[PDB]
Design a protein around this ligand. Structure first.
Ligand SMILES: [Xe]
Ligand SMILES: [Xe]
Ligand SMILES: [Xe]
Length: 263
């Protein structure tokens, strides 16, 4: 809706930074609204959904098993590892690592999962092979959050990310079981509370994944809809702002309020 793009424009003005935006119909794949759709933004932790998409593709192929247990050491633990820091002794299954990566944005979990698929280059090769030649992951946690201006490492575009997410959740790539697992993980997100969720009316479905990084970078990807069923994908990124986390959260929430209002 035009009023939503005005809110996105509002957000650019008030944050002093670029904002990228996509609304995508889930069923038809039609883009309903867009803003800076072909511009690059750091993915931050939103890449963790794509990472577990690649992991589930390997599970489908039998190259990976969700119950396989991985052990690791204190030296593997990087900043913000709220789940993985708790299982140095017992290790974690691949399923538990994806849950930690997506629902809690655990950084060590993401790096362990990246090792299982061959690293950032192999995530990027995975995306390339499902038809996304735009999105690229170049680095590990936590360096991938650096967001150096005009640096294209670890970036996506709003349009690339939205269509890639649509393919992962509803497209031919993954088995029915794996699509459902990926969206179940996203539905159980525990660290996107003040974002799109804060504008969501009772009884609506949302499955999402947020990100934050250096140099004011903030973002979220989501599948959401009324009556307990997703029907739209929404992507929002921003980078470059000196604004506080609180204000960046509130801008994303405002944009969400308008999307909901004019649904
Ligand atoms: Xe979905
Ligand atoms: Xe934003
Ligand atoms: Xe929302």
């Amino acid at each position: 809706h035009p009023e939503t793009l005005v809110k996105v424009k509002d957000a650019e003005d008030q944050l002093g930074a670029r904002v990228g935006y996509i609304e995508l119909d889930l069923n038809s794949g039609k883009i309903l609204e867009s803003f800076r759709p072909e511009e690059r933004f750091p993915m931050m932790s939103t890449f963790k959904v794509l990472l577990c998409g690649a992991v589930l593709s390997r599970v489908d192929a039998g190259q990976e098993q969700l119950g396989r247990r991985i052990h690791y050491s204190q030296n593997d633990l990087v900043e913000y590892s709220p789940v993985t820091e708790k299982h140095l002794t017992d290790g974690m299954t691949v399923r538990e690592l994806c849950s930690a990566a997506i629902t809690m944005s655990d950084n060590t979990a993401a790096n362990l999962l990246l090792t299982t698929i061959g690293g950032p280059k192999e995530l990027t090769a995975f995306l390339h092979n499902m038809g996304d030649h735009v999105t690229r992951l170049d680095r590990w946690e936590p360096e991938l959050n650096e967001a150096i201006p005009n640096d294209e490492r670890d970036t996506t575009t709003p349009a690339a990310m939205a269509t890639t997410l649509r393919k992962l959740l509803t497209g031919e790539l993954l088995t029915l079981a794996s699509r459902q697992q990926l969206i179940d993980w996203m539905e159980a997100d525990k660290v996107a509370g003040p974002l799109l969720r804060s504008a969501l009316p009772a009884g609506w479905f949302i499955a999402d994944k947020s990100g934050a990084g250096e140099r004011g970078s903030r973002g979220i990807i989501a599948a959401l809809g009324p009556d307990g069923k997703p029907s739209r994908i929404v992507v929002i990124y921003t980078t470059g702002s000196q604004a506080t986390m609180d204000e960046r959260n509130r801008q994303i929430a405002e944009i969400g309020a308008s999307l909901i209002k004019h649904w």
